Design a binder for this molecule. Structure first.
Ligand SMILES: Nc1nc2c(ncn2[C@@H]2O[C@H](COP(=O)(O)OP(=O)(O)O)[C@@H](O)[C@H]2O)c(=O)[nH]1
Ligand SMILES: Nc1nc2c(ncn2[C@@H]2O[C@H](COP(=O)(O)OP(=O)(O)O)[C@@H](O)[C@H]2O)c(=O)[nH]1
Ligand SMILES: CC(C)(COP(=O)(O)O)[C@@H](O)C(=O)NCCC(=O)O
Ligand SMILES: CC(C)(COP(=O)(O)O)[C@@H](O)C(=O)NCCC(=O)O
Ligand code: NA
Ligand code: NA
Lengths: 307, 307
């Protein structure tokens, strides 16, 4: 019964490593690992290395495709130092570990042979600032599709992929819970752009960033596990981020375990869960690769689109 | 101000013909032309021939892409007599001329060098039959997304693209206004499948045929012109299709010009216009190529996705 997809387990997947080199040390992996994430070198080797191989294979093939169009159009040819940027989306729930997957992927790709320039941008820079969300009644919907300046986000990625020298994204601060005035992330004709955020795989009545992706990941897990990870990270942040007096959620620093669980579950119930179910999970069917994690953050299963 | 698209006029577009051969005679073009359509050899040469070139370029590049995935997976390689089928979508309003564009494209592609097997399937075979539409209260919504068995349609295209030997689509009769019992269109590992229908470029919370397209056309025109074409074809069918006593709309055969205009405008107003505005036109942004026709059915402008 034919399928666009093929499923693997970790055994099956890790065999596809071939002889892709491991270019990353244990200390280097630490700088990449997010609070609460469990990634080790073994996981890098068995899961991320075949991924990086898949992508290397696709970057070459995908260039052919733009080149055929440029040929058709009777066009100059290509700068071989500036190919069309390969755009990689990374999607999934809050707390599922997207930021680790993306940082690790970036680090692996930047260590391929020619040392490609590999940029990583998070869509939280494209959230409306609080004063605008407040205007729109959206202060309790950060991460919902409507809380983003989608036009700006699409402009940004179109600019990069169309080969602009320079493009700027705004910058969000979790600690201050708002866009940072005057802050910009500048992307300068990278070879590869990884775009990471809850809703990057969305589709709609207009052309969207997902329509520009040459590859996408969705980082998945059971909803109950993701909630547990969220609540557990909320409790852990009492003595990390929330302990900063400047932190927007500094008042949570002093909560007891049981108060903190209450608070975190209410945020999950009223914001992150509804967003996952209504907006994020309906984008999973389109991902080129789903990385499914077990309750321990271990990626044990994968679903690859072959069509 | 960068753009996924590039616009042409007919001058600009026709220069991209290069020396693509014209393999089609005036008599052959007649068999392809729909009631009310204006296509001539000149239009074939200036518009359809560069299109066919673009596609030839893309079929080769696109194969590379599946081959890279097959390589990654350590897979046999490919039957060179059975490559992965290249899937072409053709979308747009009722009465806009999709069936002519698709028949002409099929005829041009089947006349490339190796004589590729080029199948053409219309999504009207995937409409629910009347008894089922009646059950669902949809007898006045034929052509709306919900009037189709989308699961069956997706099964069909997945099967073909995944390399099945044989796949069957049901068959709709306009004359009898219903799916034809026991009729099947059998598609046998074509090299190219053209899938034509109002809503083929739709996207949604599940993987859809548009997610399987290697190329798509949208046949566009101003809404007022399309309505004029629709009403004018309705009046012309009084002495063609509706004149058949078996015809479902045989009672319209005897209408005066002015009665027929009334009838046809009401159908446009209550079915086809709402469908165009709510469902079809929101898919235009995704088409690889928009063919924009002037009031005379003349394709005078084109919009190509380069990203
Ligand atoms: N300072 C601070 N950082 C947070 C908070 N919530 C999430 N983060 C960080 O924001 C980044 C994105 O987190 P999240 O949106 O849950 O996406 P994830 O990467 O898939 O877990 C991660 O580095 C989190 O550690 C918060 O409340 N305060
Ligand atoms: N017999 C008959 N054929 C029709 C009728 N309406 C449309 N057709 C034919 O059905 C095919 C599809 O028409 P339409 O859905 O308008 O799509 P188009 O190909 O873009 O014009 C065309 O060949 C039309 O000639 C009808 O009421 N009766
Ligand atoms: C910033 C986020 C919306 C994620 O943004 P992303 O980069 O995935 O677009 C999420 O990490 C977040 O901080 N949500 C806050 C929910 C609340 O208002 O408490
Ligand atoms: C059959 C159609 C819905 C087009 O089908 P398609 O192949 O575009 O999916 C349209 O040609 C049609 O016949 N509409 C009928 C509207 C009515 O019920 O009178
Ligand atoms: Na996590
Ligand atoms: Na027409």
């Amino acid at each position: 019964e034919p399928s666009p997809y093929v499923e693997f387990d970790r055994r099956q997947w890790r065999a596809l490593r071939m002889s892709t080199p491991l270019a990353l040390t244990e200390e280097e992996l630490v700088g990449l690992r997010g609070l609460g994430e469990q990634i080790d070198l073994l996981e890098v080797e068995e899961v991320y290395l075949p991924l990086a191989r898949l992508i290397h294979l696709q970057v070459a093939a995908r260039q052919r495709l733009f080149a055929a169009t440029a040929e058709f159009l009777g066009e100059p040819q290509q700068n071989p130092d500036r190919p069309v940027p390969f755009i990689i989306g990374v999607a999934g729930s809050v707390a599922v570990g997207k930021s680790t997957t993306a940082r690790v992927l970036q680090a692996l790709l930047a260590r391929w042979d020619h040392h490609p320039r590999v940029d990583l941008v998070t869509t939280d820079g494209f959230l409306y600032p609080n004063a605008e969300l407040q205007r729109r009644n959206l202060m309790h919907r950060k991460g919902f599709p409507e809380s983003y300046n989608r036009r700006a986000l699409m402009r940004f990625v179109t600019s990069v992929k169309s080969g602009s020298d320079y493009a700027c994204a705004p910058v969000y601060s979790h600690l201050h819970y708002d866009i940072i005035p005057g802050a910009e992330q500048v992307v300068r004709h990278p070879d590869i752009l990884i775009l990471e955020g809850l809703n990057v795989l969305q589709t709609g009545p207009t052309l969207m960033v997902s329509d520009l992706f040459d590859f996408s990941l969705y980082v998945d897990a059971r909803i109950e596990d993701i909630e547990q990870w969220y609540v557990s990270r909320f409790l852990a942040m009492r003595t990390t981020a929330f302990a900063d007096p400047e932190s927007h959620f500094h008042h949570y620093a002093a909560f007891s375990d049981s108060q903190a669980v209450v608070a975190a579950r209410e945020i999950w119930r009223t914001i992150n869960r509804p967003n996952l179910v209504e907006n994020i999970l309906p984008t999973r069917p389109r991902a080129t690769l789903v990385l499914r994690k077990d309750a321990d953050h271990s990626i044990n299963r994968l679903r690859l689109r072959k069509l």
